[PDB]
Amino acid sequence: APRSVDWREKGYVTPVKNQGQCGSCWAFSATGALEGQMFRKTGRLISLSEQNLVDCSGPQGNEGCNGGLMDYAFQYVQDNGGLDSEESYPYEATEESCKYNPKYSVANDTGFVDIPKQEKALMKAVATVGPISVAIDAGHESFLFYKEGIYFEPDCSSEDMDHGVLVVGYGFESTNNKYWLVKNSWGEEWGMGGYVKMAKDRRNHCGIASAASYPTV
Ligand SMILES: *C(=[N-])c1nc(N2CCOCC2)nc(N(Cc2cnccn2)C2CCCC2)n1
Known part of the structure; x- marks a missing residue:
């Protein structure tokens, strides 16, 4: 693994988005990881x-604005055979009826990889794969x-994660002093x-390595 990595500089990362007042961080973490993997596959960066x-991945266990998981999102894209572009299917910040249309699918996946629960493993994944979904x-x-x-938050838990974000x-x-570079979904004015910059190699601070994954393409 190199001493540093920033996939934004290689064109893997879309601009920062804003989830608004909806418990949909998991959807933004998952789209950010799949945007990266599709970029590596195709050379085209397309916002997803x-x-x-939020509307369609109930069968896989997601609950819209009431929470969800990135791996459930990756499973939905596999089961569905696609995922629409953000342009075709814009964000509303409330759960609504499923409106997926395959004509506007620009991404797919074939499952997902759960990274071993260690910051060294996370670093190897970030260096070899691209952006990685994580829970903190x-x-x-x-x-x-x-x-x-x-x-660096002394009171942070390595086991009690409550938010999904993207390590870029x-x-x-x-x-x-080492850090993970983390894309949130709270808009450009936050942070x-x-x-x-999340503390890195500080005893799995905030659990950043405890539930890390990315989609296969
Ligand atoms: C991201 N916005 C977000 N939102 C929530 N919630 C809690 C459910 O009500 C809506 C807001 N949850 C999460 N979670 C899932 C979670 C949270 N706490 C305990 C167990 N799971 C994160 C998604 C990746 C892992 C944690 N995110």
């Missing part, structure tokens, strides 16, 4: 529809009102342009 996932303990106001710098890289700063 979280609304398609985001349930402290220090995270809600994060602005900049390496996020890792690196270190000199101020060797650093919508990103957070």
Whole structure:
């Protein structure tokens, strides 16, 4: 694994999105991972529809704005045989009837990989695959009102995750304090342009390696 990685610079990552007042972070984490994998497959970066996932992936166990999981989203795309573009199926921030139309499918997957629950394994995955879906303990106001710098919350749990986000890289700063570069779905005004630097190799801080996965294509 290289000492740092940033898949934004290689064209794998769409702009930061905003889930609004809906428990759909899992859909944004899953679309971000599949956007990366489709880009590596095809060389085309196409924003994918979280609304398609929120409306349609109930059979796989998702609950719309009442939560869900990225692996359930990857399973839906496999079962469905496709996923629409964000342009064809824009985000509404409420669960509505399923409107998937295969004519506008721009992505597919063949299942998913669950990464071993270790930050070394996560680093190898990020370096060899692309952006990776992860779950973190985001349930402290220090995270809600994060602005900049390496996020380190002594009270964070490595087992009690409550938010899904996307690891787009890792690196270190000199101020060797290491971090994961994490894309959130709270809009560009949160954090650093919508990103957070999460402490890396600090005893699986906030559980970032505990439920990491990505779709196969
Ligand atoms: C992301 N917006 C989000 N939202 C929720 N909820 C809780 C259910 O009501 C809606 C808001 N949950 C999650 N979860 C799933 C979760 C949360 N806490 C306990 C167990 N699962 C995250 C999705 C990836 C793993 C955690 N996210």
